[PDB]
Design a protein around this ligand. Sequence first.
Ligand code: CL
Ligand code: CL
Ligand code: CL
Ligand code: CL
Ligand code: CL
Ligand code: CL
Ligand code: CL
Ligand code: CL
Ligand code: CL
Ligand code: CL
Length: 275
Amino acid sequence: GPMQPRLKVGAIPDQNPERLNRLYGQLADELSDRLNVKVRYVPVSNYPAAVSAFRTGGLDLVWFGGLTGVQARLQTPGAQVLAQRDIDARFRSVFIANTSSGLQPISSINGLTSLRGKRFSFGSESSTSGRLMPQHFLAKAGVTPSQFSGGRAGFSGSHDATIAVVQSGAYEAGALNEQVWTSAVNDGRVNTEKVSVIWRTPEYVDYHWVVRPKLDQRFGKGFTTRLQKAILGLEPTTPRQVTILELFAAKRFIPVEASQYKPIEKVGRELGKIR
Ligand SMILES: [Cl-]
Ligand SMILES: [Cl-]
Ligand SMILES: [Cl-]
Ligand SMILES: [Cl-]
Ligand SMILES: [Cl-]
Ligand SMILES: [Cl-]
Ligand SMILES: [Cl-]
Ligand SMILES: [Cl-]
Ligand SMILES: [Cl-]
Ligand SMILES: [Cl-]
């Protein structure tokens, strides 16, 4: 570059953009200070745009879901996974229902048959915790979205929006990210008189950082390792890092296990979401 290099950081748009701008904008400044390079957060409008901008070089480092990060790595030779939160090793979805819907707590996966004929919303089409794994667990109970009221599921686009369309009564039930649910309950952003959890899924792996190949050619030998150490180094010490980690709802970032994403890829191929 005739210019000094700049690291472009992105994230799937999985909740309110104003909240994500506070998190990733502060994280860009924190990485900038830790690395002594220019770092900018570049937002995207939907989940596929995160995959595509990563693939084409519009984003260098992205906070992906399970499904989107698998897609981004399959489409981008030499992309690496760098880290995940502590909680991403053992992630869950919550199935929620409007408390007027008559839907009862479910004690087994077989109980998901109760959602046949109901208005049900997934999150993003490409969401792991809001679509893929929920659709997987539904299919094991013998429920397909064809069986919901209207012959299909809603897609709200985000974990926040799934809470909002169940809370409003526009849908009777939905599925979303358990961390976003728990944070919204704790923060007062969900009316727990109107919405309750009917089921928590089995554990699966979900969010992780994926980095583009060849960043060492742009920023110098060792940079990608320094970037991975910067993420794994995040600690609740300064106000800035306390805020970053509270918005992630993590105590720390941890390394991933080699091919811990093979079960998410397998589900993605089973449900036709991976080419
Ligand atoms: Cl920049
Ligand atoms: Cl740039
Ligand atoms: Cl990945
Ligand atoms: Cl793909
Ligand atoms: Cl779809
Ligand atoms: Cl279907
Ligand atoms: Cl559908
Ligand atoms: Cl519908
Ligand atoms: Cl390189
Ligand atoms: Cl560091």
